[PDB]
Amino acid sequence: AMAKVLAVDDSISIRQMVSHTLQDAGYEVETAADGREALAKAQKARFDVIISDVNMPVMTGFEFVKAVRMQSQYKFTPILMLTTETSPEKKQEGKAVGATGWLVKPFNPETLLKTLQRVL
Ligand SMILES: [Ca+2]
């Protein structure tokens, strides 16, 4: 009954860090290199929380969140936006798509863990 996390970020390093930090903590973690892969993974497995980088090469975190929120099982699933630069503006966009919270890059393991707990 481990909480399932889907972490989306094109960065291999970020994906490894999040996956490593979270799995070591005790989460079941799947990562996706992009929004399309993330959406495919989200449709076959039931994630309890989704972490999405804001700026990715193809599908942005906002469009990914907008899309995943269309999947009925993710109508209310907590979603955390990951980014190096939050802005009053980005946070508004995050509200129009349904984002739940924000995580600032770079994060140390501790902050990542406490942030997930607040939405879970
Ligand atoms: Ca990125």
Author numbering: -1, 1 to 119
Paste lines from the article.
Vibrio cholerae contains multiple copies of chemotaxis response regulator (VcCheY1–VcCheY4) whose functions are elusive yet. Autophosphorylated CheA then donates phosphate to the response regulator CheY. Phosphorylated CheY interacts with the flagellar motor protein FliM and influence the direction of flagellar rotation from counter clock wise (CCW) to clock wise (CW). As expected, both VcCheY3 and VcCheY4 possess (β/α)5 fold typical of the response regulators.
VcCheY4 was crystallized in two different states; one is in free state with no ligand attached (VcCheY4free) and another with a sulfate and a Ca2+ ion bound at the active site (VcCheY4sulf). A Ca2+ ion is located at the active site of VcCheY4sulf which coordinates with D9, D52 and main chain carbonyl oxygen of N54 with an average coordination distance of 2.4 Å. A tetrahedral positive electron density was observed in the active-site pocket of VcCheY4sulf during refinement which was interpreted as a sulfate ion because VcCheY4 was crystallized using ammonium sulfate as precipitant. Since VcCheY4sulf was crystallized at pH 4.0, at this pH D52 might be protonated allowing the sulfate ion to come to its close vicinity. T82 and K104, which are well known to stabilize the phosphoryl group in the other reported CheY structures, stabilize the sulfate ion in VcCheY4sulf through hydrogen bonding. A movement of about 2 Å towards the active site occurs for T82 along with the β4α4 loop. Interestingly, in VcCheY4sulf, an additional hydrogen is generated between T82 and K89 (K89 corresponds to Q97 of VcCheY3) which might further contribute to the compactness of α4 in VcCheY4sulf. In VcCheY4sulf part of the β4α4 loop is stabilized and adopts a helical structure effectively extending the length of α4 and overall, the VcCheY4sulf structure seems to be more compact compared to VcCheY4free. The crucial residue at β5 that acquires ‘in’ position upon activation is a Trp (W101) in case of VcCheY4 and in both the structures of VcCheY4 the side chain of W101 acquired ‘in’ position. Considering the compactness of the VcCheY4sulf structure having a shorter β4α4 loop with low B-factors, long α4 helix, movement of T82 and β4α4 loop to stabilize the sulfate ion and additional hydrogen bond between T82 and K89, it can be said that VcCheY4 has a strong tendency to be phosphorylated in the presence of a divalent metal ion and the phosphorylated state is more stable compared to its free state.
